[PDB]
Design a protein around this ligand. Structure first.
Ligand SMILES: CC(C)N1CCC[C@@H](CO)C1
Length: 93
């Protein structure tokens, strides 16, 4: 059975106005800004942006890749598909 989200989990993350996007739950570095209550720091592959999202917008990658893991015209998306498949746990700083 599923557990709660934890750092390192791979997802497609949904934001208003954008396709379900390859992403990971990030850790929060010591001394870094913490997310709001009940939100997770989501790092978006390809764009390398961070937003804070709750579980309703987080789809586990294994379950969802057949639906959401196809190329998209949007900036950064296809780079992000490579990242989540090929090196999802690397530093992209
Ligand atoms: C869809 C995704 C790559 N972006 C676009 C909006 C900003 C970013 C994180 O704040 C999420």
């Amino acid at each position: 059975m599923p557990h709660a989200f934890k750092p390192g989990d791979l997802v497609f993350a949904k934001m208003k106005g954008y396709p379900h996007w390859p992403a990971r739950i990030d850790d929060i570095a010591d001394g870094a800004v913490k997310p709001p209550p009940n939100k997770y720091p989501i790092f978006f592959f390809g764009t390398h942006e961070t937003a804070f999202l709750g579980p309703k917008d987080l789809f586990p990658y294994d379950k969802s890749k057949d639906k959401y893991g196809k190329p998209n015209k949007r900036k950064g998306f296809n780079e992000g598909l490579w990242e989540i498949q090929n090196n999802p746990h690397a530093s992209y700083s």
